[PDB]
Amino acid sequence: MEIRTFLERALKEDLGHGDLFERVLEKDFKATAFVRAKQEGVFSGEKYALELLEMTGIECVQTIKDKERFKPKDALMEIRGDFSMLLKVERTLLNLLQHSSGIATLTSRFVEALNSHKVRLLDTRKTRPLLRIFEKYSVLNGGASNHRLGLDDALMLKDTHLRHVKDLKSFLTHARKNLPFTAKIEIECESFEEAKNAMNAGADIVMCDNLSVLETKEIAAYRDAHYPFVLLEASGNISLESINAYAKSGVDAISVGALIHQATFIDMHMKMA
Amino acid sequence: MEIRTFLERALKEDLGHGDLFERVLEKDFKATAFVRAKQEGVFSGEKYALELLEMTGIECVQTIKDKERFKPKDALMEIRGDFSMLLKVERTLLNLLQHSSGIATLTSRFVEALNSHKVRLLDTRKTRPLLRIFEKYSVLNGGASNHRLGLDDALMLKDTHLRHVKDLKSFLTHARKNLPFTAKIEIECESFEEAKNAMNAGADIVMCDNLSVLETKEIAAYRDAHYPFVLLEASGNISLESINAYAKSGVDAISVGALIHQATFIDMHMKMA
Amino acid sequence: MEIRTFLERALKEDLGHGDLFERVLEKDFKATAFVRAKQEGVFSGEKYALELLEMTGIECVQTIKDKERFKPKDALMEIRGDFSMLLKVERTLLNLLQHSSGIATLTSRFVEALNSHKVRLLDTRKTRPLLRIFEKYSVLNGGASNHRLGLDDALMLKDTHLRHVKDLKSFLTHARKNLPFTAKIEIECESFEEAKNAMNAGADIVMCDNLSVLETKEIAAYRDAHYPFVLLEASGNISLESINAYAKSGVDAISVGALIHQATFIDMHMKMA
Amino acid sequence: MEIRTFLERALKEDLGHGDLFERVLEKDFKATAFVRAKQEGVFSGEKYALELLEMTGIECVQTIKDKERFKPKDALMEIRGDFSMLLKVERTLLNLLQHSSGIATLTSRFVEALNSHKVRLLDTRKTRPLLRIFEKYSVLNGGASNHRLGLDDALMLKDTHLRHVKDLKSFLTHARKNLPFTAKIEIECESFEEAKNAMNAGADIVMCDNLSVLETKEIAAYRDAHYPFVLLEASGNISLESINAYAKSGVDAISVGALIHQATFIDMHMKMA
Amino acid sequence: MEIRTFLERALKEDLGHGDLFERVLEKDFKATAFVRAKQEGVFSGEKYALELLEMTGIECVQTIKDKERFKPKDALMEIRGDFSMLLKVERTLLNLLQHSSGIATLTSRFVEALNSHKVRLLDTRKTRPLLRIFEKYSVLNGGASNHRLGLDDALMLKDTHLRHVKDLKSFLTHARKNLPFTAKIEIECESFEEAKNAMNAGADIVMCDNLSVLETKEIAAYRDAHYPFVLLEASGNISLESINAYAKSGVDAISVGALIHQATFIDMHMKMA
Amino acid sequence: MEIRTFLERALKEDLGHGDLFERVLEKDFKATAFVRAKQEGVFSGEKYALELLEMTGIECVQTIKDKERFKPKDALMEIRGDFSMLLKVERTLLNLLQHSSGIATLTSRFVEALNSHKVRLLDTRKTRPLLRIFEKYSVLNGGASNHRLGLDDALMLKDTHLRHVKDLKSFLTHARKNLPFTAKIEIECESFEEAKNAMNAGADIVMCDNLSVLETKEIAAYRDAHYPFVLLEASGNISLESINAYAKSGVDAISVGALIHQATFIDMHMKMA
Numbered sequence A, B, C, D, E, F: 001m002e003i004r005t006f007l008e009r010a011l012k013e014d015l016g017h018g019d020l021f022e023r024v025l026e027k028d029f030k031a032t033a034f035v036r037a038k039q040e041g042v043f044s045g046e047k048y049a050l051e052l053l054e055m056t057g058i059e060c061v062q063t064i065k066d067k068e069r070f071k072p073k074d075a076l077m078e079i080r081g082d083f084s085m086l087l088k089v090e091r092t093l094l095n096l097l098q099h100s101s102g103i104a105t106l107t108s109r110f111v112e113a114l115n116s117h118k119v120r121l122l123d124t125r126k127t128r129p130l131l132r133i134f135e136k137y138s139v140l141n142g143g144a145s146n147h148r149l150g151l152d153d154a155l156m157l158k159d160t161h162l163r164h165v166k167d168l169k170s171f172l173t174h175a176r177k178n179l180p181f182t183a184k185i186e187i188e189c190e191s192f193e194e195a196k197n198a199m200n201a202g203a204d205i206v207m208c209d210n211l212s213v214l215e216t217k218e219i220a221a222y223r224d225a226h227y228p229f230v231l232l233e234a235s236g237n238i239s240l241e242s243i244n245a246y247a248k249s250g251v252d253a254i255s256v257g258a259l260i261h262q263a264t265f266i267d268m269h270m271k272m273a
């Protein structure tokens, strides 16, 4: 398990010195519980919930696969194990769930509001500390694709890196030999004129930072023109509304980091019996 | 440093095999950069930012103390160190910042909308996985107090625990001897009649789950009545609006977990030069 | 699980580069062995031991639960599993069963002199490095009760703390808003006058330090009339003889941390048979 | 370094979610502090403390060395750092100086009552969990000498191991080619007979477990006679009231694990000034 | 920092319970020492070494940067610091400088035969356990270039993968939406026919496995007319003689992972002087 | 256990952010696989593999033992688990079986060309970083024997250490009381003279570093003469073309660290079926 520790840690920060309830409890027995929802939405974080549960000695009788949709008063999980242990895990479970689910839902919404089957939805390294993965996985279980996961994943730069370079074309070449063979080089651009110097130099990918439909199409055009095998990325602010408009800019994928840093939880709770 | 690793981990998940930019860079030099804002709001996470920075070999020339307020186009930090290293830390810094700042702001707002100096604002164990502390600290730098930090912090129960007990009073006594001496026992209650069985039994604290003003006042009353030294907690949903109404229920503190699981980031970015 | 890593490290230290015997052992085989007393005492350590065994792959046949009493020559545990693993888990097993039971035993000898069903006996924060929780556990299996476990569990102030404090009453006031909601505040006082002040400032617990049986009965009495809701504990070089007296002095609880820093091993050993 | 992680852990167990007093302190500041003794004994732990101090950014002004003797009321250490920290570090620093010194002292007693500049006094493997290295280190300062540290250190066969070895001379011969090149073997014997055999098999050290001062003499002789470079160690329940007695029997070392599993805390405390 | 913990563990393993010499060393003192060649080669390991030194408290006086060439009897490093620490960091230091330079050296011997400024030499994923990154680094200081570093760095498919795949072209299509946006896809092909298929399905990189110089020049040519935007690499038991030929065969890069699993130490040693 | 964390790490370095193929796989499923040899040699690593397998929930159907000989095309292991996993685990499993077997093989060569049932062949401390234990283990299977494992194992003084010791007989005598009770000392000598001295001082093992087969004979004699229980080890740049030569000189063991720092991967691969 690559996430075995992640859970390990999440549980400890809440258990600290050790749960207080178990000290008082006299006779521990084996009971059962459900994870009803309280607000319709999608569901992500199954994988984790499963791992955590087996990791704690909690049997997962019934579960609703990820990527699935639900409505309030719906049973999402019939877990069963010792009583004491059940209560310790209660919170850590709901939490990771609600957070994963939430980003998944808020992401779901961005999907339909895209309406397309030839354009990709991407996220960003804009993630909460220590959740680079836990979240991207969530962005996924919504219907979007994930962009790069780290800074070793694919060399991607912007002005900040080139504000001291002469001859771009010649630059992207002295990199190729000083990089990993299977790494693409994506570049950020703020104006039409840039996208050109880009492609020309080699750029495996070209982004579009804060630029209007007609500003992009000129590039989406100049692209279909000479450099065809060079993906294009619409990335600026991309509001939930101005998102559909860009799908039409004839651009491969649009990255809306807001998918992650804008997703609140989703009501859920746990009841014994 | 108790948070030294927290940062340690946050940086790695993004660096993975190792940043790709540094491979290409030819001559590394020492430059400087700022952390301008892009949306007025409060600021939290100074502590971390500081630690991270020294941890990375980045000098923190100028910083704006936590709990402070800011407006767009404002410089929040003049950091200076090697160029390569500056870029690796760029993201991990903004992230933890924006997230801490965000909860701080959304919390700030809940403060003024409370208007009071005798009533406390509390949060909940409703926190994102692996951020139990990173967040509570944020809830703090907003103006609120923190409730319990874990399940070892203070024995607090609800129906779920008592749906199998006879004689509450006698119960809270066989706990005291099987608990840590400095631990209070807070109890959750959903109806007037409960608050009574509570106090009577001993309960060091009594909460109020999803109950209207007049429902609470009856208890806030019966409290000022016989059991005075028994704090009272208003905790249900407490919308940003129906929050002020409860301040008047004559209750010690009100806990609005929404403070954490509802706070999105806050625009910020980093520019060289 | 929380004590996995504890046990894990307790083993790692003894094996080092690896056991040498398993290098020369020709044919490993399943064998049974028992842990046995060689002196009388009260049993502590089950929790830890069972977890060690089931961790290493050794089956546990029979075990005397914690708190139980045992005479010498008594068989305490029966265990089966690979010969090689038994000889590795041997000292690691015994060692903790001894250090653990050693405390618990020396603890009941106090719980005796104490002799009361209204007064609680408490340990302290004076514990051997890395065994805080371990040792605290033991004290429980000794018949007494644990005080706090850390500096986050509850706020406690003594001379060193106050020497830099003006107007205490005003302090414990503008403190509650920066401490976690459930947190109790306790104060060490070396005299009656100090005692009154504390209680008044709004202390939750007052500690009667190195004070004569009398001075306590008085700081006690004063408390049963002006502040009945305050906790009082007596501490300071209390012994097996003088401990009895304090019990009968109207004082909430007594803390003789010696129950730990003055407890030694209880000779035990393991035989194959 | 080496023990940095030990201290790193010893602290994390006491701090937990975080120190409380540091939440309510108003203005931290630099300050001095002294560790005074309240009991006479011998000082151990220097090694550890100095790292604990530097590790937590505290300055060490003055400090006595390991093995130095001290009287009560003696000022042992002069530390100087931020008031807030000095406090978090206090108990830890003391706990470990009391445990370490505690051991060294009791040890120093056995070394005096042993009386002899040619016979070594040894500890064992009976140690408290997670302190193997620490406690050995302690014994060292008390003026005695360490036995092996773990199971990789050197091979020792007690009866348990032997009860399955037909022909020992071979077993030892056909074990050398497996055990690392530089390892000694030690066999536990309970009769002049066993020791006479064990030695021909080629043991490198012979344990004279629970034997009369006469039998021991016998073996010491046979040793000085036919096997000179063998090495003798007398062990078993040995106490002050019999050490000197065994010292004069020819054995090269007397082994008494009571040195650690029977040692206790030497009273100490920290003052500000 | 990323290689701290690497070095940290490389030390921990050699010291075990702790160095024995520092136990018998009477007076420690500051001394200087040099690491020296005893055979010719290309230098690798600086990054790691400097970090080891400055980590242990040893000053570095002079050092031959990485990639540099050196003859025997040449002085490679001058270091000052506590005698005791020098003797501990000794083998740990040498060992990695050797294993590291050993690779790099054996690598340049290939970069030679290769002889080209249009073709890149690449390592593989066949590395010694725990040294993936370490060894990959070395290969760089050998004059070549690294292939991918993990199974997250980029998707690669070989026989074993395809045996359970129907209609590949359709696969690489409904895959891009589940792979991270930047991810390149590469395919191992054991023949011309396989090669075409790959390219067509939309592969980003095709690997020419155990194929004759010719069959490559052909899978090459075909590619310089129908798919000019595809990467081609040749692999499979390539050696120091036959490696030259492939260079001149219109193929993007060559991957002879032997540059690692077939590289040994380069005799070096350290002298005090 | 012991090495679980080694494997846990070896995997985490290759997986990184996560395996890609597992993102695009459609329906995972159980499957078998064989590890076939493509070179003749001797099998090492069994110990590790079986843990890697069980650790990642893969079933081991059949497997050859450590030290068993194998020819090419020989099927060495039959594993059976989820297709997805079998793949993540593939390279690791092979990498470590190739490194381990690689060593054992070269070793097995020296053991044959050594020829002698009474002279031990030893490795050293010259090992690759983080594999000290692993590589020693490997040498073991090759049929040779391990020297000490670290600096805690036993004390060895080379010239460096000695260059400051006036009077060695004393130094060794007044070092015994510090070093653990069961430790051997070994001194490096470069002349019949040094060895004659070192032995009186009381060394327990004497290194005959870089000496003629004649000088070695000389020392071996003096050894058999005046110091019988001393132990001789010949070392230095020794190769197949001179082993048998030294074996017949009286020394108890020949030390050749080339066994590991010169060993390479033995070709192996994994097939599905």
Ligand SMILES: O=C(O)c1ccc[n+]([C@@H]2O[C@H](COP(=O)([O-])O)[C@@H](O)[C@H]2O)c1
Binding pocket: A123, A124, A125, A126, A147, A148, A149, A156, A208, A209, A210, A235, A236, A237, A238, A255, A256, A257, A258, A259
């Ligand atoms: O390196 C990455 O993971 C990465 C991938 C895609 C986009 N970004 C950055 O994220 C920015 C958009 O953020 P947002 O949430 O306001 O749409 C974009 O224009 C870049 O400056 C960063």
Ligand SMILES: O=C(O)c1ccc[n+]([C@@H]2O[C@H](COP(=O)([O-])O)[C@@H](O)[C@H]2O)c1
Binding pocket: B123, B124, B125, B126, B147, B148, B149, B156, B208, B209, B210, B235, B236, B237, B238, B255, B256, B257, B258, B259
């Ligand atoms: O144990 C805790 O840390 C804890 C502290 C305060 C409140 N809670 C729970 O959080 C609930 C309120 O959540 P919210 O965000 O909708 O206001 C409350 O009524 C309880 O069921 C939990």
Ligand SMILES: O=C(O)c1ccc[n+]([C@@H]2O[C@H](COP(=O)([O-])O)[C@@H](O)[C@H]2O)c1
Binding pocket: C123, C124, C125, C126, C147, C148, C156, C209, C210, C235, C236, C237, C238, C255, C256, C257, C258, C259
């Ligand atoms: O910090 C704590 O949890 C704590 C709780 C109770 C007592 N103490 C300290 O421990 C002292 C008594 O030690 P002793 O010899 O009675 O084990 C007492 O008078 C204080 O100075 C410390």
Ligand SMILES: O=C(O)c1ccc[n+]([C@@H]2O[C@H](COP(=O)([O-])O)[C@@H](O)[C@H]2O)c1
Binding pocket: D123, D124, D125, D126, D147, D148, D156, D209, D210, D235, D236, D237, D238, D255, D256, D257, D258
């Ligand atoms: O494992 C060791 O290093 C070791 C070394 C010497 C002796 N022992 C055992 O410790 C026993 C004596 O216990 P004590 O009360 O002197 O700590 C002895 O007779 C053996 O059964 C164990």
Ligand SMILES: O=C(O)c1ccc[n+]([C@@H]2O[C@H](COP(=O)([O-])O)[C@@H](O)[C@H]2O)c1
Binding pocket: E123, E124, E125, E126, E147, E148, E156, E209, E210, E235, E236, E237, E238, E255, E256, E257, E258, E259
């Ligand atoms: O997974 C990778 O990164 C990877 C990259 C390039 C090559 N390989 C494998 O390594 C094989 C060649 O090994 P060798 O003897 O040329 O070092 C090749 O034909 C594949 O089966 C594996």
Ligand SMILES: O=C(O)c1ccc[n+]([C@@H]2O[C@H](COP(=O)([O-])O)[C@@H](O)[C@H]2O)c1
Binding pocket: F123, F124, F125, F126, F147, F148, F156, F209, F210, F235, F236, F237, F238, F255, F256, F257, F258
């Ligand atoms: O540290 C050890 O365990 C150790 C044991 C035996 C020999 N050495 C050193 O290793 C040297 C021989 O190197 P080699 O090529 O046989 O690996 C020898 O003459 C010493 O300087 C080192």
